[PDB]
Enzyme design. Structure first.
Site, PDB file in Angstrom:
ATOM      1  N   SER A 126       0.848  -1.075   0.114  1.00 18.48           N
ATOM      2  CA  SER A 126      -0.021   0.071  -0.004  1.00 18.48           C
ATOM      3  C   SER A 126       0.732   1.325   0.069  1.00 18.48           C
ATOM      4  O   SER A 126       1.716   1.609   0.965  1.00 18.48           O
ATOM      5  CB  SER A 126      -1.089  -0.091   1.127  1.00 18.48           C
ATOM      6  N   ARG A 127       0.910   2.001  -1.080  1.00 18.09           N
ATOM      7  CA  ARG A 127       1.692   3.082  -1.263  1.00 18.09           C
ATOM      8  C   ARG A 127       1.044   4.359  -0.731  1.00 18.09           C
ATOM      9  O   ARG A 127       2.114   5.333  -0.264  1.00 18.09           O
ATOM     10  CB  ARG A 127       1.985   3.315  -2.973  1.00 18.09           C
TER      11      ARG A 127
END
Ligand code: ATP
Ligand code: ADP
Ligand code: MG
Ligand code: MG
Lengths: 460, 513, 173, 51, 49, 171, 85, 85, 107
Positions: free
Chosen positions: B375-376
């Protein structure tokens, strides 16, 4: 009165021009005299003004420009009901078995809408096939779909023959067989196997053979679906056998290429997934009755990745994986127990006993596949004494889930056996727990219930 | 309740009385051609691109090609009964859909018509399907958690309100299960839910609706349906209708979460509709603008700042920031992430939850694959306690997996790695749970605390599901006042650390698994 | 169907006819050619693979009532391109183009029976206000309407027939 | 169970209403066809030509 | 409940055969706006049942 | 009947169909290539005694007719996923796969068993051959399972060494 | 000018064809004189239907140990021979 | 049915007098412009490979002498050109 | 004064027809009233007979055939210089930032 005239013939594709008042609508059936024979055309497109573009069902040879065409104002419609049991028919519902007319009483159009999601009946009633490995490793419920994936020569057609026989003289329900892209030799062998085994009176056969125009091969699946739907409306739990989905997709590719549509990812037609959906979405259980189905799927060149097997996967509830290696080791049915799967295989619908037996069989076979190469290198006398027991129990399991079919008799002479699910679970659950560590391995090969295993060992 | 046929009579009499007798001018054209779902219309000089054209039978076509002397439109529904010479009328409307709270909790198709059989909708106004996303200056950063209820995703892969997370994996690996569990978990948050199914077989939708109403989540969600047998035009335009129905909430300063089921089937339906219009193809026959198909969709999943919602709603809402969260699903073939549409959507979204098939078949469910999944947006969208407890888990599990791959060739191995290869094997056995059992932040938090602070190191026999269930039941009986605090605040303190130490010590010493 | 191939030829013929003040003659010349295009024997010749020049001459011959400017040039240009079968449409487009410049509309009316010539003159004067053209009504006696009238003004239509209202009511239910 | 019975009640009521709708409008059609007069057709046309 | 609704519908059907006598001329006299010819029910017997 | 290079009838038909401006399919082959070969190969049939007795209007009785077809197909570098090979592999009752890696090594005729199938099987064998063939099938199957260890032999156990050197002698 | 025969490609057939080299139209090309054919037959024809077939249960021998033992061919079977050049 | 670069006012010029070859064979007019390729009408005197001189100081190379038009490529910036030059 | 007419709309591609002599050049910018919002079209090809094929610098939905198109005699022009520092703009040189307007001296 006939009002249309042929204006082109290019292979199997015929263009017909009508008055602009009376243009036939899509999928209507036209009729023409191809000499003394009667040829029906299916309207594929309403291109241009008054002209209509159609696929010939019979062969297009002998047609000439300017022939008169008569338009039936309804789609291709076939006879349905009891009258069709034990008969062979082509896509047009005409008898190809020389036993005279069908004796029809009602006719249904082969094109119709799928049941809405509100009409569906959620169900989990498992079918009981006569086959140990399929009952154990891949159960499926009424209204579900089963795909027999595999290469060529692995036993899909004979597995479907066995299923038809077992679910026609153990459970006495009707069945429909749609041979799309059939081989005439195999179709005659099927007819004679069903007539010799007394089950012919509970099977309705539709054949579209390989030497017929593409769309004639294409619409056969919908013909068989319409017969199965008529039996469903009577409240029956029908079972529909589709002899090869891959040849249905090939017929769709051919007919799409003839109409000059722009081709797709691998030359397949653009409509591939919509044709597959319009076929597979009519096969469902409903509040009145159900159609269960089993479909043979040929995987070309041994990859599950090209558009045909890849697009049919989205619809199946159970997948059986047949392998020619297991078949060449002389084990039939050649089901791979580790790669075949089902969505209905969980404790909540099959019970904890069935689930535990299946998972234990798979675990034993996986452990044996691990031990096989230590056996190959270091010899067996080096294995630990519990591994020397896993080996023997896996080797006996691997025998016991073979089985003699009633229809395979003409290949082997030995009689077939039908095994209830209770006996299957009892046998595997006994073997895994060591109740039969005293029997030879060959006591389990090509036997029915475990009682036959003990009796063969007593004879052996 | 039906013998009062005066009810039928009064219904019919009201329908007659309120029939309007006058007629109005309308613009009309003729069907010249029909084939494979596309029709050509002659006339309609004032047709406009994207307009809705009304066909005989109360169904619509979308005018896609305005050629010099004909209009190429795609029928939305069964086209086969149309015929040359029929006449069609031009509505003044660019493609609309109903929107509002009134369709919240109802099943509808791409055109917003209810397939539910429970009467007409009560929308407020209509929304254009093909809208435009907020600009660069109208947006806000995403720092609010949305909880999927699954320990694997909420700990290793946090999702934020306004994020776009790809659920990607091979066939039959729990993608739809993860999605509808993420929906069910929103029963009682402020987040409204939307589920768009593209190309699903009707039995799957029936099961999904039964499960959504069984677990009580249906009253809080909109279901948009385009089944496998419906015309490709309806499947291609379904996610835009769903996005408009969720953007209605976004623009009012509320929170919505929308799940597109098989975008990789929307791409196929668009390919079909494109090839049937003779448009030039691209890398796998998918049209040239297939990227601009998903992009202009997923760029509508955004968190929008308070000034935008204040100006849009003309000052009726002041403090709220709106958001729309998208969880598109992508199906790969044999896990080749580098395929065309998967590598486009991976280039669009802000992360992916890669579901691995050989973990799923091994009973590891949900089969999320660490390392390759990220998850950026990350910890900014994670509640503090979860962020504190979860920091190590992802790398610990990836290194456990590589070490356990090494292990098979190395018996009699170092006793230091012997412990890592066991803690990893216990955490990987802890992060798997039943299907329709969402777990609140407190129940996940104290389980991860038990696992991280060594309290599992003596349960090294894998009777560890019973341990989790018994720990949850114990904490639910005695210390509910602590679970309330955790669930309400999400905060973490040395005092809460001590409280959790006390709970675990009192549980180990006095109960059984 | 070849509307699209006929547009350029119709536009050129009309835009030339107004440079030489003979629109009215050109219209009937094109009407003659459009009729010769329909004969069963001429339609056989036009399909064959004659050379464009000799095929054009084999078409000039059957129509001597043509200007040097009109037949012997337009027919030859259309023959070089093989467009002669388009003549029936080159006519209609031409008519249409004329009606545009002359600010005229060929409104069509449909009724179950004849109108009173007060109704019809009111219709004329009212349509000339709805539109911005001199209308030229032509009526049709279609019985399925039963009562009222349909007014078609191109793609615009106003339906006042009792059958239309009946089958609209049938869908109000 | 009661919700499903209510759904079927809806279905039956709507079906009955639709049958009476078809037949009622067909009867209205035949009435209008038989019962008409020129003094009424002219009135309809004079209402149309108003706009 | 099924057996309840069955006979309920069967009772309704007979009364709607009376109500159609109103509703048909209602749909007529809504349309023309001309007071309909009552006693034009010479045709209505086939529309009644 | 032997058809030598059906894959050249396919090329001649592609030429004819491309000069007629027909819509090209995959590899520019026309759409109806399958319907070209199938209605050829489905003419190879065994026919029962009543068809023969009716066709000849007497003058023959009891006898069954037959026509056996052995079409030949050339593949480019052993790829089976091509168009014409796909159609003909789909049509026929079995395949004999001849491979160049076996031909070079001296195995001639270079038929590749296991990868090659006959769906008529023993029904088309004398009972002595049907009896004797099963042990050859199983021997070569076990050999194919063990063949991975060939270039590591002399590491193996003797019990599998026997299978490995028996499969070599059958080959 | 072109005239349309109503006929369809037919080819000589018979026992006299046996042992000859013939082109696709039936004309001899070996130079050993004319054919002793037994009439003509249509090139394009319809195969026997389902009910006219019979099961393949007779061997056709290749004389190859590799084929006759493991890939049997029966009279009425269709066997593809596939490979590289 | 598609057009072949015959357009309203060129058809009108042919209408005025069919034998427009009574005009100079030395020149023509640009009819379309796309990505550096140019279509020219007239130039009855053009020969393949010839340099055609455009307004400004630019040249095009005549690649195609088709039935009614010359297809050429522009040796320089082409965006400055327009129909009818 | 507008002089062109929209003749086709297919996706983002728009064809507009001009008088035979007023045909725009290749990269010129036209504009249209797409409802209330103005829309800019960048020409891409000159077809025969005054038709010009362009691509829309905006949403193509809502365009009728026959709409009036205005021919700007120059390509897309954008502001330049110090005035643009610290701002945000789109392709057409319009502030998508909301700090008002760009006081450029030159384009
Ligand atoms: N956490 C879980 N625990 C146990 N079983 C599960 C879990 N998640 C999914 N399953 C089972 O796995 C099966 C496949 O699930 P699901 O349909 O969600 O996967 P999918 O990828 O959406 O399938 P497809 O995409 O092929 O339609 C379901 O029948 C479900 O019962
Ligand atoms: N259970 C079995 N017993 C004996 N022979 C079998 C069995 N299953 C398959 N076979 C053999 O396989 C051959 C073809 O099998 P088939 O079902 O046609 O495979 P496919 O799935 O390719 O159609 C048959 O000729 C038969 O000899
Ligand atoms: Mg098969
Ligand atoms: Mg799914």
């Amino acid at each position: 009165m006939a009002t249309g005239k042929i204006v082109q013939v290019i292979g199997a594709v015929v263009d017909v021009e009508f008055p602009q008042d009376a243009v036939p609508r899509v999928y209507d059936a036209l009729e023409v005299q191809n000499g003394n024979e009667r040829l029906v055309l299916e309207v594929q497109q309403q291109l241009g003004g008054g002209i209509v573009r159609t696929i010939a069902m019979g062969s297009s040879d002998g047609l000439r420009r300017g022939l008169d065409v008569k338009d039936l104002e309804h789609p291709i419609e076939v006879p349905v009901g009891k009258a069709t049991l034990g008969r062979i028919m082509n896509v047009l519902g005409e008898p190809v078995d020389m036993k005279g007319e069908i004796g029809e009483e009602e006719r249904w159009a082969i094109h119709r809408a799928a049941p809405s999601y509100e009409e569906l009946s959620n169900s989990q009633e498992l079918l009981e096939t006569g086959i140990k490995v399929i009952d154990l490793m891949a159960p499926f419920a009424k209204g579900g779909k089963v795909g027999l994936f595999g290469g060529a020569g692995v036993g899909k057609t004979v597995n479907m023959m066995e299923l038809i026989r077992n679910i026609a003289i153990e459970h006495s329900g009707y069945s429909v067989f749609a041979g799309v892209g059939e081989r005439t030799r195999e179709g005659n062998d099927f007819y004679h196997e069903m007539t010799d085994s007394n089950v012919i009176d509970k099977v309705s056969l539709v054949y579209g053979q390989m030497n017929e125009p593409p769309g004639n091969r294409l619409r056969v699946a919908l013909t068989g679906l319409t017969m199965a739907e008529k039996f469903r409306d009577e409240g029956r739990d029908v079972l529909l056998f589709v002899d090869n989905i891959y040849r249905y997709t090939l017929a769709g590719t051919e007919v799409s290429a003839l109409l000059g549509r722009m081709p797709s990812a691998v030359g397949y037609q653009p409509t591939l997934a919509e044709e597959m959906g319009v076929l597979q979405e009519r096969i469902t259980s409903t509040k009145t009755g159900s159609i269960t189905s089993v479909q043979a799927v040929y995987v070309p060149a041994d990859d599950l990745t090209d558009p045909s097997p890849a697009t049919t996967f989205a619809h199946l509830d159970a997948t059986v994986v047949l392998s020619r290696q297991i078949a060449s080791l002389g084990i039939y049915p050649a089901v791979d127990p580790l790669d075949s799967t089902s969505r209905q295989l969980d404790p909540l619908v099959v019970g904890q006993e069935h689930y535990d037996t299946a998972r234990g069989v798979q675990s034993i076979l996986q452990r044996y596949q691990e031990l096989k190469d230590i056996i190959a290198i270091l010899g067996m006398d080096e294995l630990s004494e519990e591994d020397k027991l896993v080996v023997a129990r896996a080797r006996k399991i691997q025998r016991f889930l073979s089985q003699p079919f009633f229809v395979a008799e003409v290949f082997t002479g030995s009689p077939g056996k039908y095994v209830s699910l209770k006996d299957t679970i009892r046998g595997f659950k006994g073997i895994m727990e060591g109740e039969y560590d005293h029997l030879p391995e060959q006591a389990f090969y090509m036997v029915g219930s475990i009682e036959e295993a003990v009796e063969k060992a007593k004879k052996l | 309740m039906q013998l009062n046929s005066t009810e039928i009579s009064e219904l019919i009499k009201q329908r007659i009385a309120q029939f309007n007798v006058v007629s109005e001018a309308h613009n009309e054209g003729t069907i010249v051609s029909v084939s494979d779902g596309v029709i050509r219309i002659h006339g309609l000089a004032d047709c406009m691109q994207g307009e809705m054209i009304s066909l005989p039978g109360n169904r619509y076509a979308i005018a896609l090609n305005l050629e010099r002397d004909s209009v190429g439109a795609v029928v939305m529904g069964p086209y086969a009964d149309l015929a040359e010479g029929m006449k069609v009328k031009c509505t003044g409307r660019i493609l609309e859909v109903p929107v509002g709270r009134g369709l919240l909790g109802r099943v509808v198709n791409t055109l917003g018509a209810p397939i539910d059989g429970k009467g007409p909708l009560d929308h407020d106004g209509f929304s254009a399907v093909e809208a435009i996303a907020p600009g660069v200056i109208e947006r806000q950063s995403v720092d609010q958690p949305v909880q999927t209820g699954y320990k694997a995703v909420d700990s290793m892969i946090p999702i934020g309100r306004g994020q776009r997370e790809l659920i990607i994996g091979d066939r039959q690996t729990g993608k739809t299960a993860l999605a509808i569990d993420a929906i069910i978990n929103q029963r009682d948050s402020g987040i409204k839910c939307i589920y768009v199914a593209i190309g699903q077989k009707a039995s799957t939708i029936s099961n999904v609706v039964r499960k959504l109403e069984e677990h009580g989540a249906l009253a809080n969600t909109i279901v948009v349906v385009a089944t496998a047998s419906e015309s490709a035009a309806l499947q291609y335009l379904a996610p835009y209708a769903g996005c408009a129905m969720g953007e209605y909430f976004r623009d009012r300063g509320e929170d919505a979460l929308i799940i597109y089921d098989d975008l990789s089937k929307q791409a196929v339906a668009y390919r079909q509709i494109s090839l049937l219009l003779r448009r030039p193809p691209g890398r796998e026959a998918f049209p040239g603008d297939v990227f601009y198909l998903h992009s202009r969709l997923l760029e509508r999943a955004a968190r929008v700042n308070a000034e935008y919602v204040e100006a849009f709603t003309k000052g009726e809402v002041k403090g709220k920031t709106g958001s729309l969260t998208a969880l598109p699903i992508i199906e790969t073939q044999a896990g080749d992430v580098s395929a065309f549409v998967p590598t486009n959507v991976i280039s669009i979204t802000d992360g992916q939850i890669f579901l691995e098939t050989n973990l799923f078949n091994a009973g590891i469910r949900p089969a999320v694959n660490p390392g390759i999944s990220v998850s950026r947006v990350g910890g900014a969208a994670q509640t503090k306690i979860m962020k504190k407890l979860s920091g190590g888990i992802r790398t610990a599990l990836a290194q456990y997996r590589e070490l356990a791959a090494f292990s098979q060739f190395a018996s009699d191995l170092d006793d230091a790695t012997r412990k890592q290869l066991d803690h990893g094997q216990k955490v990987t056995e802890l992060l798997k749970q039943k299907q329709y059992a969402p777990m609140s932040v407190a129940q996940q938090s104290l389980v991860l605390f038990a696992a991280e602070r060594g309290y599992l190191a003596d349960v090294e026999l894998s009777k560890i599901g019973s341990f989790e269930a018994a720990l949850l039941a114990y904490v639910d009986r005695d210390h509910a006042p602590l679970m309330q605090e955790i669930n309400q605040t999400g905060g973490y303190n040395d005092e809460i650390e001590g409280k959790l130490k006390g709970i675990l010590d009192s549980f180990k010493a006095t109960q059984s698994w | 169907e070849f509307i699209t191939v006929a547009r350029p030829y119709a536009k050129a013929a009309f835009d030339f006819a107004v440079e030489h003040q003979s629109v009215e003659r050109w219209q009937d010349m094109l009407a003659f050619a459009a009729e010769v295009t329909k004969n069963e024997q001429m339609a056989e010749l036009l399909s064959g693979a004659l050379a464009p020049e000799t095929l054009a001459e084999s078409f000039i011959a059957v129509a001597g009532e043509q200007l040097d400017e009109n037949g012997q040039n337009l027919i030859r240009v259309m023959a070089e391109n093989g467009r002669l079968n388009a003549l029936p449409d080159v006519l209609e487009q031409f008519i249409h183009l004329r009606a545009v410049s002359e600010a005229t509309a060929e409104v069509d009316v449909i009724s179950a029976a004849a109108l009173s010539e007060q109704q019809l003159a009111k219709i004329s004067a009212a349509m000339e206000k709805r539109l911005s053209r001199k209308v030229k009504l032509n009526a049709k006696i279609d019985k399925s309407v039963m009562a009222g009238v349909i007014i078609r003004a191109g793609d615009m239509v106003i339906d006042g027939s009792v059958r239309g209202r009946l089958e609209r009511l049938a869908d109000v239910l | 169970a009661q919700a499903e019975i209510e759904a079927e009640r809806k279905r039956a009521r709507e079906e009955l209403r639709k049958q009476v709708a078809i037949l009622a409008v067909a009867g209205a059609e035949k009435i209008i066809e038989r019962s008409v007069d020129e003094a009424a057709n002219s009135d309809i046309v004079d209402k149309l030509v108003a706009e």
